[PDB]
RNA sequence: GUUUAUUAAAAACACAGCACUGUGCAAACACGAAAGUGGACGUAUACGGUGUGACGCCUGCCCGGUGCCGGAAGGUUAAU
RNA sequence: UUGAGCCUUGAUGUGUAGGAUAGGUGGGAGGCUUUGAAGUGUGGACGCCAGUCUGCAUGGAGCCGACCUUGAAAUACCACCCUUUAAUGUUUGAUGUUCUAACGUUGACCCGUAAUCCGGGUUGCGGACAGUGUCUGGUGGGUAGUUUGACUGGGGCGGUC
């Protein structure tokens, strides 16, 4: 089915997990993989490794459109934030531009309270 | 009243008949419907309260012949 | 935020993110509201930052 | 019902066939806007008289709007008394009501607008030719000879 | 065609590699999938067999002449019992079962001929024609037919092999005759 | 305030107030085989049904059963 | 267009002694591919990411067998196909798309007509829906007709037939 070549790697990197989705320029979803869905659960998936192995899984899945070069927008903190792009450079990808898109409020919604651990 | 102008059809009386064979006076009503009929020979729409069977009577005889009958027995359309 | 890195290299080069966002205003907004207690925080941030 | 059609009628009809249509369509649309009619048998033979007549008969009558030209090549030459200037070049000239009026006026009776002298139509003496028209497909050739008398 | 295009066998070497695989019904209620004693077929077919039967130290002089090649022995029951790559077939009925030298361990060979008078008497033909085809997994039929030496002359097996319909069960429709092999595949109806 | 006209006037009924729930208007609902009509010459700050009963302070836990509301892939299943 | 039948075209199998991810029986000691291959390199892709197929292609020329083991031996080749899945159809609806002309209009207007009915006509808005007839499953104390035993130291309970 179809083909595109030029694209984007989108990564949702939180603390509990990191999810990766490749999409064309017009953010229209081409493939995805999650740190949790590649094995490892718990402390298991909250690891830069689990993320690496995800970025990989995710490539063999969007090379389903012979992608060639792709910008890379990185969202959130936590592991696999950057480790997941190292997997991508190697995986076999030109890598145009890299932006951090972690969203920042201009101080609006009161965040959750506790964490008296 | 629920009467077909073509055929005379009208309510009839009967029973509903339960599983345990209880008869209860009931009615059957004719499949009535008022229908505009283009009469070519009259450059007009004659509308008739007809039974579905009626319509079929009209399709086969042709509305001119049927109206001819209403006229014959002074049934005014 | 943005690196439109060009031709001859493979390395990330995004030391940029350790100049502003990430654990900056993020570790920040992540949790306990604060309110008046940042005042108690930042009141140590100058007692420190005097020398 | 069956119903036999009148006009061409779209995805079903023809012009005078005996199709079969849902009664909802026949009453309410077709027959009222007289595009068809009940196949009352009485009718279906009203149509059998209409299956012999105009067709079988008046097409061997266009076999006469055609065999008019069986007498277009059995003479194949009218002459026009039109002279010649300074070298056998028509002092006259002959068109359609010249080649239909000098065709009619003998045993070759044609309708004046049934004579195609493409223009030459015409500008010199001697023999020429023309395209004689009686039917849409069957016309016929002759030979015209403007005689310089 | 209406019957079977036997001429639908028109580059191997010989096309006896064609198979009687006519269909049959499910097991709704109780119904089986069985083949009798060597299914012959009104047609000799041209098969010189190697029939392995359990006769005795007597029938080695005429029970070897009846469309076959040899016949095992009584010394060679358990005396020829010391190898795996060392060791149709049948056994004579009445009161003779063989699971002390024919039962252990996954083959198919039970029918030959029960003879207590003649090793190959006047009229007893039908053995050296065709093999056996029983229940396999989803149904039965599997076997062989005709060759590249017949036309509709192996269509004596058409009305005498697909006419082999045994009582169906209860919820089926067991008819669909086809064959062919070694080049392509096809057939007609039933 | 009401009520058992003729053995019961009360703590019973109604009541302002409260809640739930239905109702987009040819409303729900109701009297009517039907036409038609109330609801209303109104239109959700409106109309119906139900329960509680000024007001103050309040109205905790239970959805297993019964009732209802939503759901649908499967199973079961009518005329045909 | 999409849910169920049914008919062809192609998939595919990590029980143990092993050259190795043996589906059950069957034909079966050779077909094949220059009607242009093994396997390197990617394409769509099924998924228990263990590895398989192929339209294409760099390619450029032989692989195999009872061979001894295994309850059952060949990716030597083919099937009538079961594990389960996938691509045109056939037709059946059914879900969906428009149209208008049946039918609804408790919008507006014209006339009969000095009339908040009705009829006809014009127009707009809906529209083959809605609704009604026949048939049918469900619900149905709203209504209706009834049943709800006899013995018994009264009757009831208990007990009994
Ligand atoms: Mg009193
Ligand atoms: Mg008193
Ligand atoms: Mg209220
Ligand atoms: Mg009270
Ligand atoms: Mg309570
Ligand atoms: Mg009662
Ligand atoms: Mg009574
Ligand atoms: Mg008693």
Curated annotation (Swiss-Prot), chain A:
GO terms for molecular function: small ribosomal subunit rRNA binding; structural constituent of ribosome. It comes from the Bacteria. Keywords: Methylation, Ribonucleoprotein, Ribosomal protein, RNA-binding, rRNA-binding. Gene3D superfamilies: Ribosomal protein S11. InterPro entries: Ribosomal_uS11, Ribosomal_uS11_bac-type, Ribosomal_uS11_CS, Ribosomal_uS11_sf. GO terms for biological process: cytoplasmic translation; translation. GO terms for cellular component: cytoplasm; cytosol; cytosolic small ribosomal subunit. Has been predicted to contact the N-terminal domain of IF-3 based on footprint studies; exactly how IF-3 interacts with the 30S subunit is controversial. Located on the platform of the 30S subunit, it bridges several disparate RNA helices of the 16S rRNA. Forms part of the Shine-Dalgarno cleft in the 70S ribosome. HAMAP family: Ribosomal_uS11. Belongs to the universal ribosomal protein uS11 family. Part of the 30S ribosomal subunit. Interacts with proteins uS7 and bS18. Cross-links to IF-3. In stalled ribosomes contacts ribosome rescue factor SmrB. PANTHER family: 40S RIBOSOMAL PROTEIN S14/30S RIBOSOMAL PROTEIN S11. This is Small ribosomal subunit protein uS11. It comes from Escherichia coli (strain K12). The lineage of its organism: Bacteria, Pseudomonadati, Pseudomonadota, Gammaproteobacteria, Enterobacterales.
Curated annotation (Swiss-Prot), chain B:
Part of the 50S ribosomal subunit. The keyword Protein biosynthesis does not apply. GO terms for biological process: cytoplasmic translation; ribosomal large subunit assembly. It comes from Escherichia coli (strain K12). The lineage of its organism: Bacteria, Pseudomonadati, Pseudomonadota, Gammaproteobacteria, Enterobacterales. One of its GO terms (cellular component) is cytoplasm. Coiled coil: none annotated. This is Large ribosomal subunit protein bL28. Gene3D superfamilies: Ribosomal protein L28/L24. HAMAP family: Ribosomal_bL28. Belongs to the bacterial ribosomal protein bL28 family. It holds the Pfam family Ribosomal_L28. Keywords: Ribonucleoprotein, Ribosomal protein, RNA-binding, rRNA-binding. PANTHER family: 39S RIBOSOMAL PROTEIN L28, MITOCHONDRIAL, LARGE RIBOSOMAL SUBUNIT PROTEIN BL28M. GO terms for molecular function: rRNA binding; structural constituent of ribosome. The gene is rpmB. The keyword RNA-binding applies. It comes from the Bacteria.
Curated annotation (Swiss-Prot), chain C:
Residues 43-51 have a biased composition (Basic residues). One of its GO terms (biological process) is cytoplasmic translation. GO terms for cellular component: cytoplasm; cytosol; cytosolic small ribosomal subunit. GO terms for molecular function: rRNA binding; structural constituent of ribosome. Keywords: Ribonucleoprotein, Ribosomal protein, RNA-binding, rRNA-binding. Belongs to the bacterial ribosomal protein bS21 family. Part of the 30S ribosomal subunit. In stalled ribosomes contacts ribosome rescue factor SmrB. Probbly involved in recognition of ribosome rescue factor SmrB in stalled/collided disomes; fusion of protein fragments to its N-terminus decreases ribosome rescue in the presence of SmrB. This is Small ribosomal subunit protein bS21. The chain holds residues 4 to 54 of 71 of the full protein.
Curated annotation (Swiss-Prot), chain D:
GO terms for cellular component: cytoplasm; cytosol; cytosolic large ribosomal subunit. The keyword Cytoplasm does not apply. It comes from the Bacteria. GO terms for biological process: cytoplasmic translation. The modification N6-succinyllysine is found at residues 71, 83, 112. The modification N6-acetyllysine is found at residue 89. Keywords: Acetylation, Ribonucleoprotein, Ribosomal protein, RNA-binding, rRNA-binding. The keyword Magnesium does not apply. GO terms for molecular function: large ribosomal subunit rRNA binding; structural constituent of ribosome. One of the primary rRNA binding proteins, it binds very close to the 3' end of the 23S rRNA. HAMAP family: Ribosomal_bL9. Part of the 50S ribosomal subunit. In stalled/collided disomes (pairs of ribosomes where the leading ribosome is stalled and a second ribosome has collided with it) bL9 in the collided ribosome contacts bS6 and uL2, while it contacts only helices of the 16S rRNA in the stalled ribosome; the inter-ribosome bridge thus formed is different from that formed between normally translating ribosomes. Belongs to the bacterial ribosomal protein bL9 family. This is Large ribosomal subunit protein bL9. It comes from Escherichia coli (strain K12). The lineage of its organism: Bacteria, Pseudomonadati, Pseudomonadota, Gammaproteobacteria, Enterobacterales. The gene is rplI.
């Amino acid at each position: 089915r179809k083909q595109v070549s030029d694209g984007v790697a989108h990564i949702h990197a939180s603390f509990n997990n990191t999810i990766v989705t490749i999409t064309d320029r017009q953010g229209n979803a081409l493939g995805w993989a999650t740190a949790g869905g590649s094995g490892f659960r718990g402390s298991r998936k909250s690891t830069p490794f689990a993320a690496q192995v995800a970025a990989e899984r995710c490539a063999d899945a969007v090379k389903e459109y012979g992608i060639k070069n792709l910008e890379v927008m990185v969202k959130g903190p936590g592991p696999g934030r950057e480790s997941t792009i190292r997997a991508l450079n190697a995986a076999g990808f030109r890598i145009t531009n890299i932006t951090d898109v972690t969203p920042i409020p201009h101080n609006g919604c009161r965040p959750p309270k506790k964490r008296r651990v | 009243s629920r009467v077909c102008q073509v055929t005379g059809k009208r309510p009839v009386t009967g029973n509903n008949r339960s599983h345990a064979l209880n008869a209860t006076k009931r009615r059957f009503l004719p499949n009535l419907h008022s229908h505009r009929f283009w009469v070519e020979s009259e450059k007009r729409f004659v509308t008739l309260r007809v039974s579905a069977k009626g319509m079929r009577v009209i399709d086969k005889k042709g509305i001119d012949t049927v109206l001819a009958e209403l006229r014959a027995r002074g049934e005014k359309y | 935020i943005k690196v439109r890195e060009n031709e001859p290299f493979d390395v990330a080069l995004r030391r940029f993110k350790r100049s502003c966002e990430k654990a900056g205003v993020l570790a920040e907004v992540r949790r306990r509201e604060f309110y008046e207690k940042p005042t108690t925080e930042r009141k140590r941030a100058k007692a420190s930052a005097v020398k | 019902m069956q119903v036999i059609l009148l006009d061409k009628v779209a995805n079903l009809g023809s012009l005078g066939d005996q199709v079969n249509v849902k009664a909802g369509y026949a009453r309410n649309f077709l027959v009222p806007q007289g595009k068809a009619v009940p196949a009352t048998k009485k009718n279906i033979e009203f149509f059998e008289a209409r299956r012999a007549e105009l067709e079988a008969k008046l097409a061997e009558v266009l076999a006469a709007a055609n065999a008019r030209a069986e007498k277009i090549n059995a003479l194949e030459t009218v002459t026009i008394a039109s002279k010649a200037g300074d070298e056998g070049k028509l002092f006259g000239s002959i068109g359609t009501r010249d080649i239909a009026d000098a065709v009619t006026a003998a045993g070759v009776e044609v309708a004046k607008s049934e004579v195609r002298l493409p223009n030459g139509v015409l500008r010199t003496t001697g023999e020429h030719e023309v395209s004689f028209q009686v039917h849409s497909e069957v016309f016929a050739k002759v030979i015209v000879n403007v005689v310089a008398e | 065609k209406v019957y079977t295009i036997d001429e639908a066998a028109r580059t191997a070497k010989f096309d006896e590699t064609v198979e009687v695989h006519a269909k049959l019904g499910i097991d709704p209620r109780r119904s089986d999938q069985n083949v009798r004693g060597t299914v012959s077929l009104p047609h000799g077919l041209g098969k010189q067999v190697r029939v392995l039967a359990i006769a005795k130290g007597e029938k080695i002089k005429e029970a070897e002449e009846a469309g076959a090649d040899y016949v095992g022995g009584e010394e060679i029951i358990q005396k020829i019992l010391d190898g795996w790559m060392d060791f149709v077939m049948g056994a004579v009925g009445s009161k003779l079962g063989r699971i002390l030298g024919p039962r252990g361990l996954n083959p198919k060979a039970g029918t030959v001929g029960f003879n207590i008078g003649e090793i190959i008497r006047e009229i007893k033909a039908g053995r050296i024609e065709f093999r056996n085809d029983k229940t396999g997994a989803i149904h039965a039929p599997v076997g062989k037919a005709s060759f590249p030496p017949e036309k509709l002359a192996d269509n004596i097996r058409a009305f005498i092999r697909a006419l082999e319909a045994h009582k169906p069960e209860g919820a089926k429709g067991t008819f669909l005759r086809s064959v062919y092999v070694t080049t392509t595949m096809g057939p007609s109806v039933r």
